[PDB]
Amino acid sequence: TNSAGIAQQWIQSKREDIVNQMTEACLNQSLDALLSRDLIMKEDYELVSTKPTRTSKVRQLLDTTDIQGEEFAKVIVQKLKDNKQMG
Amino acid sequence: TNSAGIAQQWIQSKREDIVNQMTEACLNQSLDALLSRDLIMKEDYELVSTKPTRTSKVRQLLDTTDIQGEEFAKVIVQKLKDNKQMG
Amino acid sequence: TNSAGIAQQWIQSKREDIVNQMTEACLNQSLDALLSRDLIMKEDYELVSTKPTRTSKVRQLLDTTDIQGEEFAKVIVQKLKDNKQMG
Amino acid sequence: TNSAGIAQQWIQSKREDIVNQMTEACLNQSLDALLSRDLIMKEDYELVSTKPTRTSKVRQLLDTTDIQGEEFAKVIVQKLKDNKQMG
Amino acid sequence: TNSAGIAQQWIQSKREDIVNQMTEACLNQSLDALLSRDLIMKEDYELVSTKPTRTSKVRQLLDTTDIQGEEFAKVIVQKLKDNKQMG
Amino acid sequence: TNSAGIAQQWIQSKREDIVNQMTEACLNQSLDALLSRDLIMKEDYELVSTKPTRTSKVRQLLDTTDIQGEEFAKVIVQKLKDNKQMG
Amino acid sequence: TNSAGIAQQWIQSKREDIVNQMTEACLNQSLDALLSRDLIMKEDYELVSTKPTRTSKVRQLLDTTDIQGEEFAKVIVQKLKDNKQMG
Amino acid sequence: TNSAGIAQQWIQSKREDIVNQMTEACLNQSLDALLSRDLIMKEDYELVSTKPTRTSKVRQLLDTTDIQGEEFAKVIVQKLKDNKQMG
Amino acid sequence: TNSAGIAQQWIQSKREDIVNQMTEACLNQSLDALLSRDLIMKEDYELVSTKPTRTSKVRQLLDTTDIQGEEFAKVIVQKLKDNKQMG
Amino acid sequence: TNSAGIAQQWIQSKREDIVNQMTEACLNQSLDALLSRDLIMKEDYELVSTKPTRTSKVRQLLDTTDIQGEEFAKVIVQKLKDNKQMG
Amino acid sequence: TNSAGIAQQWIQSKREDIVNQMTEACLNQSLDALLSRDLIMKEDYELVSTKPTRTSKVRQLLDTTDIQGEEFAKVIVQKLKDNKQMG
Amino acid sequence: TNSAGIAQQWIQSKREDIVNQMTEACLNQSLDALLSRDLIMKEDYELVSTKPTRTSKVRQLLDTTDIQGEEFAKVIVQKLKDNKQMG
């Protein structure tokens, strides 16, 4: 609950960093594992994959991160730690 | 009348499948034959061709399918059967 | 139905592996047999063949894998087993 | 007027064929003669020349064919007849 | 006064043609020369440049054509004649 | 019509074989007879003749085989039979 | 103030020329020096770098030229003079 | 001004001929004298020198011919006359 | 004009024969007289003289035959008649 | 932190030089050591390795340099100093 | 698994050395044993064998080394040890 | 700086002459002294040494001359003066 909420909160706590740190591949592989574990429907997936710029593709994931809770978010947190990108 | 209505009804009966089964090319070739036989005006055609995602481009055709009746719809039914996509 | 759905699901179950395991030739020969048996229209084929990177060419096939069902997918599963690549 | 309208209408009458019959060179030489006789502005020319697939490059010309009338279209009709491609 | 009024009236006299004849580049270059000579404020310019379809972008200019009089309109008339598009 | 379509279809039916069976000379002599009978424009001919690998030069012909119909394809079928290569 | 305003005004005074005179390299080097001196944020930079045509990439810079004032614009004026392109 | 404009216009007047008449050496020597007199930046030069076919390398110069005016074009006109190729 | 065009057309009319009939010496002496009368630049000459096989050296001349018109071609026609090879 | 930031800032401070000074081998060896120490994912690596021109391949690395921080950048700074290229 | 992964990792650990140490014959014999044991398809084999420089032919193998895992890589490790080249 | 820049500029000032005046031995000895003093990496050296024609081998050096500055260029200027070739 708490650290579950903190997980997406930490995303929201450092969201400016995710605009900086997350690449397209850091995005698109993270788009993959969500679509792999089916944490996102494809209609929402097409929304992120059609935005023109990186930051436009970033924010659509990160807005969808908030509405989908912790398990959607924890893997993205795990993505940046499995990257060891440490942003 | 009846099967004429059923034709667009069958579209509405399996609309979730058309979100699944219809591609962009299954869309855009179907956009072609409607524009070929002039079953759609170009103002409505530009509406479908400008939506950002596939499903956004799907639903705009499928909403326009209902208001335009059977002959607009029967060719789209014929499109999926001329595809032999069988969705 | 079920294993038919599981076939493209197994693709979606291990999609990160297909980003890893599938080469260009593992891609392009798989593009061939689909185009050989006419499981893909050429407009969708040109979409995959024009993407700049391997992973960009990978994802376009794999997105088209989901919308086209089992027979489109089963041969790609058969491709990796006829490769005996075992990914 | 009439056959002038029929000229671009015949294009719209068989547009699926132009997706089939017209190549890249059948496209790009037709792009040339329009740009030769200045029937197209270069901003519209860059739109066609930047689309990724053939069919994407096809449709942009063919959409621009309708808005530009007969003289823009008659040479394209003459192109397919000077090709003797007879599509 | 009169031909000044007729200039935007001729636009209104053949407005259906401007939905047909005017392209995006015929639009956007005409958007340029108005913004070049500062016949439009940028807030009104952003209104036209954000509409999703061509016809949506067409009508916003053409509605703004009526409220801004002759000098705003005469250059657009001159645009179609400098195009020699003759619509 | 039918066997005319089957002729290029048989090419598409066994396209993996044409990646295997067709050599460079089996390619380039087939490029000759098409250019001899003027079934290909030289702009499309330069596209095939500039690809770096055999298979890259193979696929460009075989993609151009589909868009150009039967008479373009029947001689290539006749080429493999005049070769008596029997692939 | 005045010549500061005139600097971006001169850009707006001859904007049709910048559609003509500015190349991609005249664009992209000008995109560089702005990003070098950090006169543009990268989110706005990705907007220009993703537009499909030259003129689409031109106008996005030139629209961003107006909202960012003189120092953003003076270097672009200096760019065309350091080019000695004299447009 | 006029004959200055006519110089690049004559290029555009007979552009189909330049697709025909200009060789690679007629291209690449013309690429040299532009790069000799520094009428082209090297970023634009690399764009022409990387296109796969002759016509692809032709059109990139000829598109860059229009945006760069007369002095960029007059030497290319002088190139074909110093060639005495008379196309 | 006509027989001037027919001269290189007759080359294109029987190009398969030139793959057959023309030797290396029938090639290289024909390369000489073109270089003697300066109908070819040396950069294009080095292109033909570096291809590995006869047919590779044949096609490079014969492709250069089309872009260089009649006087470049008429001597090659005269070469085969001064040979009295009669191909 | 500071000199860590300055390291990628110095890259951004002299980015026009990196368009000049960095070769393909200065690029591709620098692409190697990043891929050697795994400072880049291969999806981002394929993006740089597929761009057509040097400068297109340059900017994709240099854009990826900013989003990946100091350790990604410090080795590239070390690359130019281990080159002793001193740009 | 681990030393299996380390085997291709050791390749990636010292990849700069493989640019140095591996010759053409150290390459091409290694290309042989992979093609002998059928660890590579011929389409991927033609990709390596067509690159112009040694390092271009090196990197294409070494990129294909990563996507094909351990057994593809272990023999290449065994190749350098059967060479006793000890790089 | 200035004469340092002029040194490679003089190369660019008379580049058509270097296409004329420089032989293969004037090339390859100049390739030697650069490789002797290690002004070129071997990956760039293999690029020049693999081009098929002299002019193809010429331009690759001369393009690499511009990106590598003065000391790379001054010895090539010294090469033509130590030749006393005086081109």
Residue numbers in the entry:
A (entry chain K), B (entry chain G), C (entry chain H), D (entry chain D), E (entry chain F), F (entry chain E), ...: 430 to 516
How does the study describe this entry?
Second, we reconstituted homogeneous RIP2–CARD filaments and determined the 4.1-Å resolution cryo-EM structure of the active complex. We then constructed the atomic model of RIP2–CARD filament and validated it using pairwise charge-reversal mutagenesis. These findings provided a direct view of how RIP2–CARD is organized in a C1 left-handed helical filament upon activation. A 13 amino acid tag was added to the N-terminal of residue 432 of RIP2–CARD and the last 11 amino acids at the C-terminal end of RIP2–CARD were removed to stabilize the core RIP2–CARD filament and prevent filament bundling on the EM grid. As a typical Type I interface, residues from helix 1 and 4 (orange, Type Ia, R444, E445, and D492) interact with charged side chains from helix 2 and 3 (red, Type Ib, Q458, D461, Y474, and K471). In Type II interactions, residues at the turns between helix 2/3 and helix 4/5 (orange, Type IIa, D495, Q497, E472, and D467) mainly interact with residues located within the turn between helix 1/2 (green, Type IIb, N449, T452, and K513). Type III (orange and blue) interface was relatively weak and it was stabilized by interactions between residues from helix 2 (orange, Type IIIa, T479, E475, K471, and E472) and coiled turn between helix 3/4 (blue, Type IIIb, R483, T482, T484, and R488). Overall, the stability of the RIP2–CARD filament was maintained by a collection of weak charged interactions involving almost all surfaces of RIP2–CARD. Cellular activities were completely abolished when we disrupted the native interaction pairs E445–Q458 and N449–D495. When the interactions at these sites were rescued by introducing reversely charged interactions pairs, E445R–Q458E double mutant regained its activity and was six times more active than any of the single mutants.
